[PDB]
Write an enzyme that holds these catalytic residues in place. Structure first.
Site, PDB file in Angstrom:
ATOM      1  N   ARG A  63       0.796  -1.230   0.000  1.00 26.18           N
ATOM      2  CA  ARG A  63       0.000   0.000   0.000  1.00 26.18           C
ATOM      3  C   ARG A  63       0.823   1.272   0.000  1.00 26.18           C
ATOM      4  NH1 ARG A  63      -5.461  -0.593   1.391  1.00 26.18           N
ATOM      5  NH2 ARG A  63      -5.286   0.888   3.161  1.00 26.18           N
TER       6      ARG A  63
ATOM      7  N   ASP B 106      -2.653  12.207   9.576  1.00 20.83           N
ATOM      8  CA  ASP B 106      -4.044  11.957   9.134  1.00 20.83           C
ATOM      9  C   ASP B 106      -4.778  13.297   9.086  1.00 20.83           C
ATOM     10  OD1 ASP B 106      -6.787  11.238   8.836  1.00 20.83           O
ATOM     11  OD2 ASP B 106      -6.486   9.400   9.998  1.00 20.83           O
TER      12      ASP B 106
ATOM     13  N   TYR C 288      -6.875   5.093  17.929  1.00 12.89           N
ATOM     14  CA  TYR C 288      -6.212   5.455  16.678  1.00 12.89           C
ATOM     15  C   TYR C 288      -6.050   6.960  16.565  1.00 12.89           C
ATOM     16  CZ  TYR C 288      -5.594   6.721  11.815  1.00 12.89           C
ATOM     17  OH  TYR C 288      -5.173   7.371  10.666  1.00 12.89           O
TER      18      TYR C 288
HETATM   19  N1  LIG Z   1      -5.156   4.617   3.650  1.00 13.47           N
HETATM   20  C1  LIG Z   1      -5.577   5.856   3.912  1.00 13.47           C
HETATM   21  O1  LIG Z   1      -6.526   6.372   3.316  1.00 13.47           O
HETATM   22  C2  LIG Z   1      -4.920   6.685   4.981  1.00 13.47           C
HETATM   23  C3  LIG Z   1      -5.623   7.766   5.478  1.00 13.47           C
HETATM   24  C4  LIG Z   1      -5.065   8.597   6.446  1.00 13.47           C
HETATM   25  C5  LIG Z   1      -3.795   8.305   6.918  1.00 13.47           C
HETATM   26  N2  LIG Z   1      -3.115   7.235   6.427  1.00 13.47           N
HETATM   27  C6  LIG Z   1      -1.785   6.905   6.994  1.00 13.47           C
HETATM   28  O2  LIG Z   1      -0.847   6.566   5.990  1.00 13.47           O
HETATM   29  C7  LIG Z   1      -0.017   5.462   6.413  1.00 13.47           C
HETATM   30  C8  LIG Z   1      -0.130   4.348   5.388  1.00 13.47           C
HETATM   31  O3  LIG Z   1      -1.520   4.038   5.316  1.00 13.47           O
HETATM   32  P1  LIG Z   1      -1.901   2.569   4.765  1.00 13.47           P
HETATM   33  O4  LIG Z   1      -3.356   2.490   4.497  1.00 13.47           O
HETATM   34  O5  LIG Z   1      -0.954   2.160   3.709  1.00 13.47           O
HETATM   35  O6  LIG Z   1      -1.530   1.639   6.024  1.00 13.47           O
HETATM   36  P2  LIG Z   1      -2.036   0.138   6.358  1.00 13.47           P
HETATM   37  O7  LIG Z   1      -2.058  -0.644   5.066  1.00 13.47           O
HETATM   38  O8  LIG Z   1      -3.224   0.178   7.265  1.00 13.47           O
HETATM   39  O9  LIG Z   1      -0.820  -0.296   7.310  1.00 13.47           O
HETATM   40  C9  LIG Z   1       0.527  -0.152   6.860  1.00 13.47           C
HETATM   41  C10 LIG Z   1       1.422  -1.214   7.482  1.00 13.47           C
HETATM   42  O10 LIG Z   1       1.450  -1.074   8.879  1.00 13.47           O
HETATM   43  C11 LIG Z   1       2.087  -2.197   9.388  1.00 13.47           C
HETATM   44  N3  LIG Z   1       1.694  -2.508  10.767  1.00 13.47           N
HETATM   45  C12 LIG Z   1       0.450  -2.612  11.278  1.00 13.47           C
HETATM   46  N4  LIG Z   1       0.485  -3.024  12.562  1.00 13.47           N
HETATM   47  C13 LIG Z   1       1.817  -3.173  12.856  1.00 13.47           C
HETATM   48  C14 LIG Z   1       2.591  -3.604  14.024  1.00 13.47           C
HETATM   49  N5  LIG Z   1       1.947  -3.960  15.130  1.00 13.47           N
HETATM   50  N6  LIG Z   1       3.932  -3.618  13.920  1.00 13.47           N
HETATM   51  C15 LIG Z   1       4.554  -3.254  12.803  1.00 13.47           C
HETATM   52  N7  LIG Z   1       3.945  -2.847  11.678  1.00 13.47           N
HETATM   53  C16 LIG Z   1       2.584  -2.834  11.667  1.00 13.47           C
HETATM   54  C17 LIG Z   1       1.598  -3.371   8.493  1.00 13.47           C
HETATM   55  O11 LIG Z   1       2.677  -4.182   8.058  1.00 13.47           O
HETATM   56  P3  LIG Z   1       2.478  -5.760   7.615  1.00 13.47           P
HETATM   57  O12 LIG Z   1       1.520  -5.719   6.455  1.00 13.47           O
HETATM   58  O13 LIG Z   1       3.871  -6.071   7.191  1.00 13.47           O
HETATM   59  O14 LIG Z   1       1.989  -6.557   8.775  1.00 13.47           O
HETATM   60  C18 LIG Z   1       0.933  -2.652   7.319  1.00 13.47           C
HETATM   61  O15 LIG Z   1       1.306  -3.143   6.022  1.00 13.47           O
HETATM   62  C19 LIG Z   1      -0.521   5.082   7.805  1.00 13.47           C
HETATM   63  O16 LIG Z   1       0.288   5.744   8.788  1.00 13.47           O
HETATM   64  C20 LIG Z   1      -1.917   5.645   7.872  1.00 13.47           C
HETATM   65  O17 LIG Z   1      -2.385   5.900   9.219  1.00 13.47           O
HETATM   66  C21 LIG Z   1      -3.671   6.431   5.503  1.00 13.47           C
HETATM   67  C1  LIG Z   2      -8.443   4.631   5.602  1.00 18.16           C
HETATM   68  C2  LIG Z   2      -7.405   4.934   6.713  1.00 18.16           C
HETATM   69  C3  LIG Z   2      -7.384   6.082   7.410  1.00 18.16           C
HETATM   70  N1  LIG Z   2      -6.361   6.031   8.286  1.00 18.16           N
HETATM   71  C4  LIG Z   2      -5.746   4.864   8.125  1.00 18.16           C
HETATM   72  N2  LIG Z   2      -4.666   4.382   8.796  1.00 18.16           N
HETATM   73  C5  LIG Z   2      -4.207   3.161   8.474  1.00 18.16           C
HETATM   74  N3  LIG Z   2      -3.147   2.633   9.083  1.00 18.16           N
HETATM   75  N4  LIG Z   2      -4.843   2.437   7.443  1.00 18.16           N
HETATM   76  C6  LIG Z   2      -5.939   2.901   6.781  1.00 18.16           C
HETATM   77  O1  LIG Z   2      -6.422   2.118   5.912  1.00 18.16           O
HETATM   78  C7  LIG Z   2      -6.396   4.138   7.131  1.00 18.16           C
END
Ligand SMILES: NC(=O)c1ccc[n+]([C@@H]2O[C@H](COP(=O)([O-])OP(=O)(O)OC[C@H]3O[C@@H](n4cnc5c(N)ncnc54)[C@H](OP(=O)(O)O)[C@@H]3O)[C@@H](O)[C@H]2O)c1
Ligand SMILES: Cc1c[nH]c2nc(N)[nH]c(=O)c12
Ligand SMILES: NC(=O)c1ccc[n+]([C@@H]2O[C@H](COP(=O)([O-])OP(=O)(O)OC[C@H]3O[C@@H](n4cnc5c(N)ncnc54)[C@H](OP(=O)(O)O)[C@@H]3O)[C@@H](O)[C@H]2O)c1
Ligand SMILES: NC(=O)c1ccc[n+]([C@@H]2O[C@H](COP(=O)([O-])OP(=O)(O)OC[C@H]3O[C@@H](n4cnc5c(N)ncnc54)[C@H](OP(=O)(O)O)[C@@H]3O)[C@@H](O)[C@H]2O)c1
Ligand SMILES: NC(=O)c1ccc[n+]([C@@H]2O[C@H](COP(=O)([O-])OP(=O)(O)OC[C@H]3O[C@@H](n4cnc5c(N)ncnc54)[C@H](OP(=O)(O)O)[C@@H]3O)[C@@H](O)[C@H]2O)c1
Ligand SMILES: Cc1c[nH]c2nc(N)[nH]c(=O)c12
Ligand SMILES: Cc1c[nH]c2nc(N)[nH]c(=O)c12
Ligand SMILES: Cc1c[nH]c2nc(N)[nH]c(=O)c12
Lengths: 250, 250, 249, 250
Positions: free
Chosen positions: D13, D143, D156
């Protein structure tokens, strides 16, 4: 003897409730108004019947213009004329209507009204209040939704943001004079008279705390707190009174 | 063919650096100026020598008045007249001076200049930009110290707060048109000409990252990012470029 | 039929002033403490001498650990044991000391600073809600959260987390009629260890009066937020800082 | 020689896109992962096939515990062991799930995982990064919706708020070492795999700019900007990359 307050736009709605509560607290009040003379005069009548010569009316347009500074000076002057002192200024009067960026009033008139009422008049009233100077303070009626603004309300939103800046800048500058400067930021309180009931109910349903708008009196309660002795160390603070509305994502 | 940008107050200092960097990136530029005609013409010469027919000057007062909407319309028209398109607007021109609340410009003039340049002109230029409409965007020059303002700079601070509101409101409203609206917020960059060296050094000493003010080019780098294809999902964001200054307590 | 409040870290200083004002307003109070047992018992005695059977003490460590949820549940249980109800929670207890990035282990520093300032408030909030009038929670925040003291990263992280809790819990608990708000001092009672010279340096920075807030001034804001005059206020953090957070470097 | 970066949670991701884009920019990278071993190794293989000896993997749980400080030291050490330097730290790994205040994992485990990954591990990695020390910087994935949080996501949201605090505190404290600390704040980017299609579309429709989520690459672009020489004066800044989502009222 009793302190005195100026409340702008005090004839109706939230300004009226603020004036009434201040008066119930012991203040003499200047009821400022623009078009609502009947309502302003009626309110002053109600308050003076309660306590003789504790209320006066003062009419002024607070649109930005060449004469706005003199107008604001005269509002503060009218408090000293009536009561010999001015302890509290509440900047409540406010124009509120859409001004879309992409295509009645000319845009320069919209600028004048929305920025004048919400920002420039408060600045000029603040100048005049301070120049003329205990528990002295200013309360600015701000907007809890200023960072999640209504669509097509750019000039309104600009005026409210400018009012936050004034609140902070004046708090800093007037602190040496013992004048505190704070804000109260409603989310939805009394909804606009021209809004349809269906649209009103839609806003109410968004408010986490009780799915209803704030009463004008609930807004006034925060003003009373800020002007009180229980807020003596509070300056530059803006208290949301929004039932959590500003916390709700789209 | 090459995209085009309007930069306001582009004859000197930060706006000049912005115009230069936009031009280096491939833009045709309208160098807006008010009083600095020699500097503006000189800059257009230098840019047209690098690439013929890629820079023009455009003179306008951005003080608030009833003809400010026409002046702002004409600035956007000047870009279309010269280049047939207008892809980027940078709102950089700004009046900056103290306006104390207590104690030879009239206050009407101070309001018109400080609120006109910092807020109303940006709004009217945004309206005109949008009305006339690819990677379209607007960049507003904001101020990282907007919530820790300089003593006695109420009107300036009001204008910059209003500009934050405009940035957000316009981002929301113009998103359907593919127009992004963002900001860049310096802390200290090029210090004012009139500021004394002791005072400049006191500000420098406060900046955590390097104990020095930003270059104009460093500010321009953030503008370049925001207008670029690397910022395509960014709208309504204000990027501080302040070396940590806004994080430092009193 | 008098309402009841839990005030954490209530034996001294600002928490004491909050407990006293709440008591003066008519609340029965749980005076939570950690190490300050003598001061806590002495306060409970003053309050009960005013109004019989209106104050009790409750000891607990609020450092993060796997038993912290149980400890927090027990603090709320102690209010129901003594008074049969719990109307107000004030999250005041807080560890405060530097943790530079470059005797205590870092594990301990995380546990104390994040535990007391953020995690215990969360667990106390969960237990308070689970056991449920004018119900509310007041979190003691910090007006300088965005202009932090040098080398106080963990303290500052905890106070930022507390803002997030205040907002998240206001949202989630609104349908239960529980309001959640904050009070954010700038400088109030300066740390006991601080030298008089250093104190004066901080006092001189405050625009409003060039002095620190009294504990009572902080307490006044708490009293407002729990009162019926704040019945539509939730998710709001009231600075009580005399303009300090507005002052540039 | 080539600078080196650590990216946490880089197997999938947004973290994966970050590692790839850094690698494309010329960085050697440490791919940290927790459970996604196959993806982590496949990425390392891909990057090394592109340029030899430019990618390694490091596994660790970032849940808060007595051993987390040592795990975080080991992650930083893996970059030094492989590449002899560590220039950039990206704190991306993050647990994300609901933790209702009113009624699987115990609550203490929820606290450990949510506050550990989003705040505590970032802090400990930052300590380790700084202690071991050119264009050095740290980028934290924040975020944009931190102030309009998802219902029942208290822990969170607490962790992400704490991460804002870390970003600012570390920017201030590390500035004298020339280490910049900034954040990137997505609104919606890659939606969670477990989210239903209908719910996904509901989120997309709320985004003003294009009514869709950000690609991971668009998030990565802001990271690249912040680590670049074009961001040399920027520290303590959090750039929203949210398409205006956070500006949209309820
Ligand atoms: N997706 C969104 O729309 C969104 C929105 C707002 C903010 N963000 C921020 O952007 C960043 C990336 O988002 P994302 O959606 O790509 O993240 P995600 O897929 O939810 O998580 C990213 C990685 O975090 C690792 N992780 C989770 N629990 C863990 C633990 N206990 N120890 C070590 N690693 C751990 C996992 O690694 P493994 O797969 O290797 O287990 C996972 O692949 C995050 O900080 C998220 O909060 C994302
Ligand atoms: C959708 C979203 C908002 N914030 C998030 N943080 C993590 N780690 N993974 C997610 O998928 C999201
Ligand atoms: N109602 C809400 O839900 C809400 C929400 C957020 C913020 N607020 C803020 O709270 C305050 C009170 O709100 P409200 O709904 O009670 O306000 P309002 O009824 O919309 O306006 C109050 C008064 O403003 C005065 N006014 C308008 N244009 C003026 C002008 N050009 N010159 C002088 N006075 C002028 C009018 O006086 P006359 O009637 O005498 O002409 C009017 O009665 C406002 O500052 C508002 O922005 C309200
Ligand atoms: N310098 C800093 O450290 C700093 C800090 C924070 C924010 N900023 C922001 O960054 C931007 C650029 O800063 P700067 O120091 O380069 O600005 P500046 O030199 O103070 O002003 C830029 C230009 O504004 C134009 N201007 C002033 N009044 C005007 C009017 N009435 N009508 C039209 N144009 C007018 C002037 O053009 P002419 O010379 O042609 O008359 C001037 O050259 C500004 O928006 C500023 O507030 C700067
Ligand atoms: N003082 C200020 O200027 C100021 C400024 C900004 C914010 N605030 C906030 O206002 C609140 C009160 O400030 P204050 O100066 O009165 O607080 P304080 O005296 O520093 O601490 C209050 C109490 O917290 C308790 N505490 C500390 N560590 C604990 C642990 N591990 N477990 C349980 N309890 C623990 C202690 O109880 P025992 O004594 O019983 O061990 C202590 O009496 C705090 O949340 C603070 O962060 C204060
Ligand atoms: C509903 C509302 C939000 N902000 C407002 N400002 C004014 N002046 N009048 C209103 O009715 C409203
Ligand atoms: C030093 C400074 C802060 N903000 C400013 N705005 C303008 N227009 N010009 C300046 O020189 C400054
Ligand atoms: C002076 C101060 C600011 N923040 C604080 N937090 C606690 N717990 N104790 C203190 O003394 C202070």
């Amino acid at each position: 003897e009793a302190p005195a307050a100026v409340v702008t736009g005090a004839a109706k709605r939230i300004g009226r409730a603020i004036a009434v509560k201040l008066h119930q607290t012991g203040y003499r009040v200047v009821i400022h108004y623009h078009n609502s003379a009947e309502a302003a005069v009626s309110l002053a009548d109600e308050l003076n019947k309660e306590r003789s010569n504790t209320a006066v009316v003062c009419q002024a347009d607070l649109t930005n213009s060449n004469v706005l500074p003199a107008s604001c000076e005269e509002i503060i002057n009218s408090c000293f004329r009536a009561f010999g002192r001015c302890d509290v200024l509440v900047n409540n009067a406010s124009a509120f209507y859409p001004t879309p960026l992409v295509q009645g009033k000319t845009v320069e008139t919209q600028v004048a009204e929305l920025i004048g009422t919400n920002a420039i008049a408060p600045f000029l009233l603040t100048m005049s209040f301070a120049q003329r100077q205990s528990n002295l303070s200013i309360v600015n009626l701000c907007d809890a939704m200023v960072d999640q603004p209504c669509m097509a309300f750019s000039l309104y939103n600009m005026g409210k943001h400018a009012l936050v800046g004034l609140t902070q800048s004046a708090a800093l500058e007037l602190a040496p004079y013992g004048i505190r400067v704070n804000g109260v930021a409603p989310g939805v309180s009394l909804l606009p008279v021209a809004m349809g009931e269906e649209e009103k109910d839609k806003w109410r349903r968004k408010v986490p705390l009780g799915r209803r708008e704030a009463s004008a009196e609930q807004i006034a309660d925060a003003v009373i707190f800020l002007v009180s002795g229980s807020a003596q160390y509070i300056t530059g603070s803006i208290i949301k009174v929004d039932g959590g509305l500003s916390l709700v994502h789209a």
